[PDB]
């Protein structure tokens, strides 16, 4: 496979897709802001278990509007008035408007978008408005001793309001699997793995395993998460993982490290 | 109280241009599109086009292409559709009602004047 | 442009009938269609809003519901004053479009 290459700078080139590579992506991103609309788009190969998916977000009197689109074909990343389709509330952590109760409207450009509304915490924070990820009509999240990742998302109007999800204010679901991250040397290691209180709608119990995508390490996590959150795809944009394994089940500490 | 006051009832002859107003009050005019709806005889409601005060920005449907012309003056509050070339079948109602130009559904299409007759004979 | 498909155009109910009106969408127009009231003097008012969201002093028995490309509006009690015209309007994207109205009657 071989796919267009090319930087910020905008200077373009066809890379021949390392070993393993079979998809091409293009990465928009855009940034309205009283009156100059500020587009920089990169292009390569990329890794398997990826899909189009996009974000667009109103910050104060600024809107950040991110998408990016694959495809499979040599060369398919190559080329490529008011449309209102779902008020949106939104917001962002890049100025503490989310945290906040400055919650702005945001109306969908594209009939296939839907209200989102993240959390995320280790390694923006909080994030509301219009984007699509695939089969998303529903929430899905998960946590461990440290990180929490959560995403609700809705096709009604004004769905994704009210308050700002936090962990701490959710339930204990009784359910308790194992929390750990790391690799099965220092990091995943048994003695570094232990019990933690599952939360909220995320009563599964969860292990999945990797490579980070920056660095050729492989890479471990366990924790408390929703079913839909049990997902190939979900788990390796959270992370940057990819290459992966997750498995999930509903017997507190059926994550254990003997028991994979 | 919010309103959308529309011009008097016209008797035209066929051939030509007659100006309709839609003068607006109750809130700020330049945060809303003006749109203008016919409606003919025993017919049903048709989209003319639109335009945001105060700004050179209007849109319309392409088949009033040439006959409606829009235009809006801040200081007196007023939106205008000028219908050139008149013929039989301009003979209609002709309804404003505001479009805001923010994201915030509840605000589109919310509140309507009553209307203006244009009839148009020989 | 899209255009919108409204059923039925004519229909006859007594005092108390439930009610449904539906406009179907030649393409996807998300959540984004209005239904509108007009009175035998002309007079036009806005009923729902957004697909579902019912406007402001508007009595709950109206409704407002989506299913797919159907989106339809729906009277549970109806009243004396309920028998008048009707039309959906969408504004996903220019041109707008309208439905083709739909005229309510009292059954004797």
């Known amino acids: 496979l071989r796919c267009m290459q090319c930087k910020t700078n905008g200077d373009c080139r066809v890379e021949e897709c390392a070993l393993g590579q079979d998809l091409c992506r293009t990465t928009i991103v855009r940034l309205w802001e009283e009156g100059e609309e500020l587009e920089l788009v990169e292009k390569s190969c990329t890794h398997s278990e990826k899909t189009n998916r996009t974000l667009s977000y109103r910050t104060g009197l600024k809107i950040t509007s991110l998408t990016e689109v694959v495809c499979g074909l040599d060369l398919c990343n190559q080329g490529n008035s008011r449309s209102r389709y779902l008020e949106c509330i939104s917001c962002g952590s890049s100025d503490m408007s989310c945290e906040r109760g400055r919650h702005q409207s945001l109306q969908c450009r594209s009939p296939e978008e839907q209200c989102l509304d993240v959390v995320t915490h280790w390694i923006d924070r909080h994030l509301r408005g219009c984007g699509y990820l695939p089969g998303c009509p529903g929430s899905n999240g998960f946590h461990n001793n440290d990180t929490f990742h959560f995403l609700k998302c809705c096709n009604t109007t004004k769905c994704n309001e009210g308050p700002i999800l936090e962990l701490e204010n959710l339930p204990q679901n009784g359910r308790q699997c194992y929390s750990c991250k790391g690799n099965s040397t220092h990091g995943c290691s048994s003695e570094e793995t232990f019990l933690i209180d599952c939360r909220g709608p995320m009563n599964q119990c969860l292990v999945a395993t990797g490579t980070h995508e920056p660095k050729n390490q492989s890479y471990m996590v366990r924790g408390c998460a929703t079913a839909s959150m049990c997902q190939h795809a979900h788990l390796g944009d959270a992370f940057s993982m990819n290459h992966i394994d997750v498995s999930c089940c509903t017997k507190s500490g059926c994550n254990h490290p003997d028991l994979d | 109280q919010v309103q959308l006051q529309q011009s008097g009832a016209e008797l035209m002859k066929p051939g030509a241009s007659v100006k309709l107003s839609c003068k607006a009050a109750?809130?700020?005019?330049?945060?809303?599109?003006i749109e203008w709806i016919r409606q003919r005889p025993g017919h049903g409601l048709e989209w003319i086009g639109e335009?945001?005060?105060?700004?050179?920005?209007?849109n319309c449907n392409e088949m009033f292409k040439g006959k409606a012309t829009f235009t809006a003056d801040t200081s007196s509050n007023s939106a205008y559709m000028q219908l050139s070339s008149l013929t039989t079948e301009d003979s209609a109602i002709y309804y404003c009602?505001?479009?805001?130009?923010?994201?915030?559904?509840?605000?589109?299409?919310?509140?309507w004047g009553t209307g203006t007759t244009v009839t148009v004979s020989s | 442009d899209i255009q919108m498909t409204q059923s039925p155009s004519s229909l006859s109910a007594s005092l108390g009938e439930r009610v449904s009106l539906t406009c179907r969408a030649s393409?996807?127009?998300?959540?984004?269609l209005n239904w509108l009231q007009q009175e035998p003097d002309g007079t036009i008012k806005r009923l729902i809003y957004?697909?579902?969201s019912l406007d402001s002093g508007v009595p709950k028995r109206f409704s407002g519901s989506r299913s797919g490309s159907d989106y339809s509006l729906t009277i549970s009690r109806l009243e004396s004053e309920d028998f008048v015209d009707y039309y959906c309007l969408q504004y996903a994207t220019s041109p707008y479009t309208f439905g083709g109205g739909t005229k309510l009657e009292i059954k004797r």
């Open positions: 393409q996807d127009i998300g959540s984004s």
């Open positions: 009602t505001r479009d805001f130009s923010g994201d915030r559904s509840n605000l589109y299409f919310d509140v």
């Open positions: 335009i945001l005060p105060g700004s050179s920005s209007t």
């Open positions: 109750g809130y700020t005019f330049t945060a809303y599109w």
């Open positions: 957004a697909t579902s």
